[PDB]
Amino acid sequence: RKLEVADEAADKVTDLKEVKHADIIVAGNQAYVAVVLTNGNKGAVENNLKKKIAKKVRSTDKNIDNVYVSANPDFVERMQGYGKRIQNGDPIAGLFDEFTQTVQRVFPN
C-alpha cells in the first residue's frame, strides 16, 4: 500500500547514455520503472539494458529486489501522472487501485 517516488533511483538510471528519462515508483521491495530511450525504441526494452537499469535502481536501496522496466508510451504517461500526484501530497488511497491495474497490465505474471 506504500507507494514512493524514487527520484534518486531515476537519476542513477539517466546516468546511462541509453536512457533519456525515467519515472520510478517503489511499492515495498518492488521498483516499477518507465523509461524513454535515447534511440526512441518504445518496444520491449533489450534484455542487457534492462539488467543495467535494474543494477542502477538496486544501487540506491538495499531493500529493492525486483525491478520491472518498460518503455511502453502509455505506461510512461501513467507513471509521470502517478509521480506528480504522490509528490504533490495526494492520498495513496486515491490512486493505489489505478496503479495496481497499470502494473498488472504492463507486467503480467
Curated annotation (Swiss-Prot):
GO terms for biological process: sporulation resulting in formation of a cellular spore. It comes from the Bacteria. GO terms for cellular component: membrane. Keywords: Germination, Lipoprotein, Membrane, Palmitate, Signal. It is found in: Forespore inner membrane. Transmembrane segments: none annotated. Disulfide bonds: none annotated. The keyword Signal applies. Induction: Expression is dependent on sigma G, and to a much lesser extent on sigma F. It is a lipid-anchor. Disruption phenotype: Mutant sporulates normally and has the same resistance to heat and UV radiation than wild-type spores. It exhibits no defect in the initiation of spore germination, but the spore outgrowth is slower than that of wild-type spores. Mutant shows a reduced rate of spore germination in L-alanine. Probably contributes, directly or indirectly, to early events in germination. May play a role in spore outgrowth. This is Probable spore germination lipoprotein YhcN. It comes from Bacillus subtilis (strain 168). The gene is yhcN.
